[PDB]
Amino acid sequence: SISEKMVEALNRQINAEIYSAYLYLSMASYFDSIGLKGFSNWMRVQWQEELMHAMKMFDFVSRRGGRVKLYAVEEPPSEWDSPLAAFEHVYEHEVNVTKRIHELVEMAMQEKDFATYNFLQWYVAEQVEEEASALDIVEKLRLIGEDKRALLFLDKELSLRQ
Amino acid sequence: SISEKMVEALNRQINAEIYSAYLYLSMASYFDSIGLKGFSNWMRVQWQEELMHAMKMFDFVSRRGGRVKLYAVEEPPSEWDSPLAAFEHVYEHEVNVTKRIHELVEMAMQEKDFATYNFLQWYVAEQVEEEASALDIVEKLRLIGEDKRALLFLDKELSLRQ
Amino acid sequence: SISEKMVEALNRQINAEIYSAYLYLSMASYFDSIGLKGFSNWMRVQWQEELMHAMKMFDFVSRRGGRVKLYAVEEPPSEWDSPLAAFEHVYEHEVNVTKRIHELVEMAMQEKDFATYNFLQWYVAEQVEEEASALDIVEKLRLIGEDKRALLFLDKELSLRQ
Amino acid sequence: SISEKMVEALNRQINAEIYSAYLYLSMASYFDSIGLKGFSNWMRVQWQEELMHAMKMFDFVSRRGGRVKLYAVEEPPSEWDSPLAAFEHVYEHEVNVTKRIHELVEMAMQEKDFATYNFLQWYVAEQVEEEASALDIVEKLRLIGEDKRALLFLDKELSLRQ
Amino acid sequence: SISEKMVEALNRQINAEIYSAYLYLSMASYFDSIGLKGFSNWMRVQWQEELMHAMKMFDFVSRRGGRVKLYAVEEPPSEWDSPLAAFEHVYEHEVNVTKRIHELVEMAMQEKDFATYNFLQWYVAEQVEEEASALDIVEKLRLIGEDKRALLFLDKELSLRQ
Amino acid sequence: SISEKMVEALNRQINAEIYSAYLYLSMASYFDSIGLKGFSNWMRVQWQEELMHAMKMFDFVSRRGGRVKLYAVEEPPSEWDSPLAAFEHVYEHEVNVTKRIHELVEMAMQEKDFATYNFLQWYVAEQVEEEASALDIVEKLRLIGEDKRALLFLDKELSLRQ
Amino acid sequence: SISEKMVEALNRQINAEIYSAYLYLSMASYFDSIGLKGFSNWMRVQWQEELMHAMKMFDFVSRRGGRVKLYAVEEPPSEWDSPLAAFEHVYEHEVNVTKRIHELVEMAMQEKDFATYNFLQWYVAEQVEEEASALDIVEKLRLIGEDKRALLFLDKELSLRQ
Amino acid sequence: SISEKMVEALNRQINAEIYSAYLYLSMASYFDSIGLKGFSNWMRVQWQEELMHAMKMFDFVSRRGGRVKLYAVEEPPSEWDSPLAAFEHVYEHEVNVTKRIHELVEMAMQEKDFATYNFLQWYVAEQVEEEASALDIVEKLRLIGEDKRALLFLDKELSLRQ
């Protein structure tokens, strides 16, 4: 059920998801110095929604009859050129997360892990809506522009997240 | 009245608190293969008690007229020779985390920053309770030994933490 | 046991807070000819939130064994070309309202009067958020413009102040 | 204390309220031809609240020992170049109805009729609250312009009137 | 869509329905000077029950994609030889209100408006019922007279209506 | 409307009522230095009863067609020759403010401004209890003396004020 | 960690706080033999309100990783020339209780205990407030005397305290 | 995630499921002319249970980052020879629906869509019970016959569907 090739790559998926949480938190400073409370709520909620997906894999790997591993969290970006970018950079660090599981899926069908195939369907179904909730934000600064009539209505429309 | 140095030493105590969540999370997993269900509850809680000391400085950084900074969370140790050795390491990682901020306290009685002294007092009032959660547990691993029949009454007595 | 020196610099901050409540009430008249009902309420709330910080010091002086003194509330500006000038003068009068107490900390940390210091402990934790309600108010007026299309979505969000 | 002239000049104020109700209910059509559903709603409540002030004065005249009298309601305008210009004509013909009462206050203070002096007091104190909802709205419609970006948030916030 | 031929005969039915309500408020003054207090409740309720059949039609044409027009509310009559004649006098301006809708059934196959047969059906089914509360009251005030044996229990018996 | 000749007489009573409210917060001190808790309680509540009638006139001035202005309102005394002087100055500045307003009352009936007459009756009905709530405190304080059996029963019996 | 220098001055503050409570139980006997029953409720409540500031400190040093020490609770005084002197006599052993903590602020940068400035802050903020319920009672029992005109309503007025 | 081969075949699965809903509705006319209320309820419930499965694919395809397409609804059958046939024709248009998804499943594993594989499990699990709820109806007219003692008990047993 466990391969040291598959046991090392699951601890590798956790540092990038913890990093994406350390990277969304860098847009809350970009939102608190610039003046955005929607990105601060979309980041204070995403800094706790991605780190809870990394505790779901330490409690799912620590049940297969093996030992878990803490890996290396790389340094993430801090700044971004616009509000369209935090939706596109969240949509870049998104597609970097779906192929990372789709490559481990065939790396589960080649390493003989049909138990992690059904275990990644909940990781393959959330990582499809997380890119539309960002694309809807990227196709919205484009659906807005450089205006600021919705910046008073987008900051307020993003504070109801939990 | 503002120095670009203390936000990084506060980000270094925040990096040590960012590290302690990956270091307690690596002490919750080595015990789940060993046979602790309590260390997972006290450490996933210490994995969540460490993320709360670095966010009070990220909400204080977004209020003094400044920016926070993201660094590298290094990989931490994973294993220990026993459950008792990680208990002796908690009496090492206690004053070493308080002095790094207490150095900012003495860097506050010399640099005139009365905003970080009362703000670390809540880190100095918790790091008397955070340091107390180790001595009463260590003076219990010495009262047991290398047996583990009374260690099974600690797993049930440490699973009620949240 | 009791010093009449810490009481006069507090009688200047209590009177300066009575003016800062009386000078913010003069920004409620400045907002009704242009067309703002929100900039008056963030002022109609601080006209009642600042007078409680000067009455919290008249009830701490009449319990420390002393007497308070009534001073002169000076005249403030009345008209402005915009909402940023009433916002930028408050971010100058912030550290300028903070220094009058930061001077009271040093006449208490050297003269041994921890009754006005702990009373000044409550003034150093609010004056980090009170500048954020000014930095967040100015860093929105600088990011908006003279586009009175976004000044109207803040008025509804500023008529909600209490 | 009863004159058939002061009761008939008051019964003429009911026709002026019938026109001000027929001219304000005719400004809701000015919103259905232009494209406003809020301006139809902010006027339909005042056109029926002013006609509610015209049915309440027929019982104060039918209490002085007399009969009321119905006169002629003139025809009003239908279309307009804007809502602020129709508000500025509304901020003139409103107080112009208050002076019409300012004519009845002295025509009661000269004939010893303390029953007709106080009877105009709930309308002369009310005709002080009716004018700021036009002056603050026109000096805001003047603060907006022809951009039509803030006018769609004024229609919805004014359709909640009852 | 909309033809300006049906809209002018509709503003005349709206003006005639505003009149049938404008004719009853003067039958409360003819009754409050004569000595009836029931007709003051019965006409002021009827002054608001008739404006509801034209407000169901003044709010229905300005929603069909057309414009309404405000006309002149004329001055009404004041006196009557008795209370019974004014009950039959409501029966002359009544069939004239039943006739205002009966012309549109034949005016719908020529103006191409198959919507006005069913829209005038609530006024052609009601304005035959509004007359039975008048014909049975007129054939009851007339079977009595100008007497005072049956008239004091009929005036009050209409004051519990709303 | 409102004229700045008459609008200056409304902003002048506000400074005397704000002083009398700032003098009452300073007449709370003549009892708080001695050791009385009711006369201190009778002042923090009366300091808000003049500010509750003068803040309704700052929101009545920004809607009546004028501008308000904050100038410099002078302070007041700290000490008194007796306990009666902080109470007799309250019984002197009371009817004299009704007269100070009685000079302004005729300045509304002289400019044909029935808009300030109904608004000053609320200023003429409040300044009739303000002379009874002080004269009744002085005409009771004269019957005791310098004793402390009824001066201590007035301190506890006045702590029930809100 | 823990130094035996701060723990001995703390068992003296614990013994001095056990004494300030041990000194009040003998002021209930001096009052129950004299003829006061209010001081029996006011001292037995004060005998348990003072043991709560040292039990907040006797349970705080034996949790910091150290040892407490039990000393001798001495015999206390019994008599007084009046009830007012024993109210001022509580004001001599008081500043001696306010002084027991003021030495640790300067004893924290030398014994390396930045925890005792904030831990003595609840006793340095309270033992100035415990004196206002004593100074205002002493400047009230002394402005009266050994008389019986103001003393019978003050003894009972402290018996509703807990 | 989206292929124009797979983007066209998903809009092709919707017209046949909308057609099966237009085809079950043709057995309600066959049930309303013949005399069946069980097939009318099994068709009025299935005409709304299959069209809700076609809105689940327009809201699942309009989230993959593409555009949806409305296709061609073919004409369906209207009549059937018996009640065993509407269970067998529903069981013919059933098996025409399971292979249609099982062919697109390998047309998802050849077009690289492992996100539509988990998305079709809810379409592959319902389309297995829909053939037993029809087969149980086909093996029931065979378990009945041409009798009509259960036609009074089958029409009634099919009206509790929602």
mmCIF file of N, CA and C in Angstrom, chain D residues 47-90:
data_model
loop_
_atom_site.group_PDB
_atom_site.id
_atom_site.type_symbol
_atom_site.label_atom_id
_atom_site.label_comp_id
_atom_site.label_asym_id
_atom_site.label_seq_id
_atom_site.Cartn_x
_atom_site.Cartn_y
_atom_site.Cartn_z
ATOM 1 N N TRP D 47 -45.833 60.702 -2.248
ATOM 2 C CA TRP D 47 -47.049 61.145 -2.903
ATOM 3 C C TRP D 47 -48.280 60.644 -2.187
ATOM 4 N N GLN D 48 -48.090 59.685 -1.296
ATOM 5 C CA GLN D 48 -49.203 59.112 -0.567
ATOM 6 C C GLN D 48 -49.078 59.460 0.897
ATOM 7 N N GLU D 49 -47.946 60.054 1.244
ATOM 8 C CA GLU D 49 -47.704 60.515 2.596
ATOM 9 C C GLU D 49 -48.010 61.993 2.674
ATOM 10 N N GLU D 50 -48.163 62.617 1.516
ATOM 11 C CA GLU D 50 -48.484 64.026 1.451
ATOM 12 C C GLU D 50 -49.973 64.138 1.272
ATOM 13 N N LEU D 51 -50.540 63.111 0.665
ATOM 14 C CA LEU D 51 -51.974 63.004 0.524
ATOM 15 C C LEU D 51 -52.531 62.486 1.831
ATOM 16 N N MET D 52 -51.632 62.049 2.701
ATOM 17 C CA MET D 52 -52.007 61.589 4.021
ATOM 18 C C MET D 52 -51.933 62.758 4.976
ATOM 19 N N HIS D 53 -51.367 63.851 4.484
ATOM 20 C CA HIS D 53 -51.313 65.110 5.203
ATOM 21 C C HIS D 53 -52.441 66.003 4.741
ATOM 22 N N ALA D 54 -53.112 65.574 3.686
ATOM 23 C CA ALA D 54 -54.207 66.332 3.126
ATOM 24 C C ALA D 54 -55.560 65.779 3.531
ATOM 25 N N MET D 55 -55.555 64.637 4.196
ATOM 26 C CA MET D 55 -56.792 64.055 4.672
ATOM 27 C C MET D 55 -56.923 64.267 6.171
ATOM 28 N N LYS D 56 -55.800 64.594 6.801
ATOM 29 C CA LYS D 56 -55.706 64.874 8.233
ATOM 30 C C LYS D 56 -56.018 66.304 8.638
ATOM 31 N N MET D 57 -56.141 67.175 7.657
ATOM 32 C CA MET D 57 -56.396 68.575 7.907
ATOM 33 C C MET D 57 -57.829 68.895 7.591
ATOM 34 N N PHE D 58 -58.541 67.891 7.119
ATOM 35 C CA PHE D 58 -59.951 68.035 6.849
ATOM 36 C C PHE D 58 -60.713 67.675 8.100
ATOM 37 N N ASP D 59 -60.011 67.092 9.056
ATOM 38 C CA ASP D 59 -60.605 66.751 10.332
ATOM 39 C C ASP D 59 -60.225 67.766 11.399
ATOM 40 N N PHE D 60 -59.457 68.772 11.014
ATOM 41 C CA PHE D 60 -59.092 69.832 11.934
ATOM 42 C C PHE D 60 -59.912 71.041 11.572
ATOM 43 N N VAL D 61 -60.440 71.006 10.355
ATOM 44 C CA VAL D 61 -61.316 72.034 9.837
ATOM 45 C C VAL D 61 -62.748 71.632 10.101
ATOM 46 N N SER D 62 -62.965 70.326 10.181
ATOM 47 C CA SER D 62 -64.254 69.756 10.522
ATOM 48 C C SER D 62 -64.328 69.567 12.012
ATOM 49 N N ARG D 63 -63.638 70.433 12.730
ATOM 50 C CA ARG D 63 -63.592 70.369 14.169
ATOM 51 C C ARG D 63 -63.598 71.764 14.740
ATOM 52 N N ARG D 64 -63.542 72.749 13.860
ATOM 53 C CA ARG D 64 -63.552 74.138 14.268
ATOM 54 C C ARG D 64 -64.965 74.672 14.220
ATOM 55 N N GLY D 65 -65.883 73.825 13.782
ATOM 56 C CA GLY D 65 -67.273 74.204 13.671
ATOM 57 C C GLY D 65 -67.538 74.676 12.272
ATOM 58 N N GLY D 66 -67.190 73.837 11.307
ATOM 59 C CA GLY D 66 -67.298 74.220 9.920
ATOM 60 C C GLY D 66 -67.340 73.096 8.910
ATOM 61 N N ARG D 67 -67.228 73.491 7.649
ATOM 62 C CA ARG D 67 -67.260 72.597 6.512
ATOM 63 C C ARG D 67 -65.986 72.787 5.727
ATOM 64 N N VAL D 68 -65.523 71.733 5.074
ATOM 65 C CA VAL D 68 -64.357 71.849 4.221
ATOM 66 C C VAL D 68 -64.795 72.155 2.803
ATOM 67 N N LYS D 69 -63.849 72.513 1.946
ATOM 68 C CA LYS D 69 -64.174 72.850 0.568
ATOM 69 C C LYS D 69 -63.126 72.349 -0.407
ATOM 70 N N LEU D 70 -63.578 71.739 -1.493
ATOM 71 C CA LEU D 70 -62.695 71.255 -2.540
ATOM 72 C C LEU D 70 -62.523 72.257 -3.678
ATOM 73 N N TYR D 71 -61.271 72.506 -4.053
ATOM 74 C CA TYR D 71 -60.935 73.441 -5.121
ATOM 75 C C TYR D 71 -60.355 72.736 -6.340
ATOM 76 N N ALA D 72 -59.623 73.485 -7.162
ATOM 77 C CA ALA D 72 -59.072 72.981 -8.423
ATOM 78 C C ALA D 72 -57.593 72.606 -8.373
ATOM 79 N N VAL D 73 -57.298 71.353 -8.705
ATOM 80 C CA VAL D 73 -55.930 70.862 -8.856
ATOM 81 C C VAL D 73 -55.341 71.074 -10.246
ATOM 82 N N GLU D 74 -54.344 71.937 -10.345
ATOM 83 C CA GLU D 74 -53.770 72.258 -11.634
ATOM 84 C C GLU D 74 -52.982 71.099 -12.206
ATOM 85 N N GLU D 75 -52.742 71.145 -13.509
ATOM 86 C CA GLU D 75 -51.945 70.143 -14.201
ATOM 87 C C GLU D 75 -50.455 70.412 -14.080
ATOM 88 N N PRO D 76 -49.669 69.349 -13.886
ATOM 89 C CA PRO D 76 -48.217 69.352 -13.706
ATOM 90 C C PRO D 76 -47.459 68.824 -14.909
ATOM 91 N N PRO D 77 -46.128 68.926 -14.869
ATOM 92 C CA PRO D 77 -45.118 68.473 -15.825
ATOM 93 C C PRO D 77 -44.980 66.964 -15.867
ATOM 94 N N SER D 78 -44.366 66.447 -16.923
ATOM 95 C CA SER D 78 -44.251 65.009 -17.096
ATOM 96 C C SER D 78 -42.813 64.540 -17.272
ATOM 97 N N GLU D 79 -42.051 65.249 -18.093
ATOM 98 C CA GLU D 79 -40.696 64.827 -18.412
ATOM 99 C C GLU D 79 -39.688 65.825 -17.878
ATOM 100 N N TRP D 80 -38.427 65.415 -17.808
ATOM 101 C CA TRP D 80 -37.395 66.272 -17.258
ATOM 102 C C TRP D 80 -36.009 65.964 -17.783
ATOM 103 N N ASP D 81 -35.149 66.971 -17.781
ATOM 104 C CA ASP D 81 -33.803 66.805 -18.286
ATOM 105 C C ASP D 81 -32.976 65.992 -17.310
ATOM 106 N N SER D 82 -33.383 65.988 -16.045
ATOM 107 C CA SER D 82 -32.728 65.181 -15.031
ATOM 108 C C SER D 82 -33.559 65.070 -13.771
ATOM 109 N N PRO D 83 -33.083 64.272 -12.811
ATOM 110 C CA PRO D 83 -33.636 64.046 -11.476
ATOM 111 C C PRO D 83 -33.149 65.037 -10.430
ATOM 112 N N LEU D 84 -32.013 65.669 -10.684
ATOM 113 C CA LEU D 84 -31.476 66.659 -9.768
ATOM 114 C C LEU D 84 -32.093 68.017 -10.032
ATOM 115 N N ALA D 85 -32.484 68.246 -11.273
ATOM 116 C CA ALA D 85 -33.095 69.504 -11.655
ATOM 117 C C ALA D 85 -34.535 69.487 -11.209
ATOM 118 N N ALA D 86 -35.089 68.286 -11.156
ATOM 119 C CA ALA D 86 -36.442 68.063 -10.692
ATOM 120 C C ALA D 86 -36.450 67.973 -9.186
ATOM 121 N N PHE D 87 -35.257 67.900 -8.612
ATOM 122 C CA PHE D 87 -35.076 67.891 -7.173
ATOM 123 C C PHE D 87 -34.771 69.296 -6.700
ATOM 124 N N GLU D 88 -34.213 70.097 -7.597
ATOM 125 C CA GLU D 88 -33.907 71.475 -7.286
ATOM 126 C C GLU D 88 -35.134 72.315 -7.469
ATOM 127 N N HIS D 89 -36.064 71.835 -8.279
ATOM 128 C CA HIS D 89 -37.339 72.508 -8.422
ATOM 129 C C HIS D 89 -38.235 72.024 -7.305
ATOM 130 N N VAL D 90 -37.873 70.872 -6.752
ATOM 131 C CA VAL D 90 -38.553 70.294 -5.602
ATOM 132 C C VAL D 90 -38.020 70.839 -4.299
#
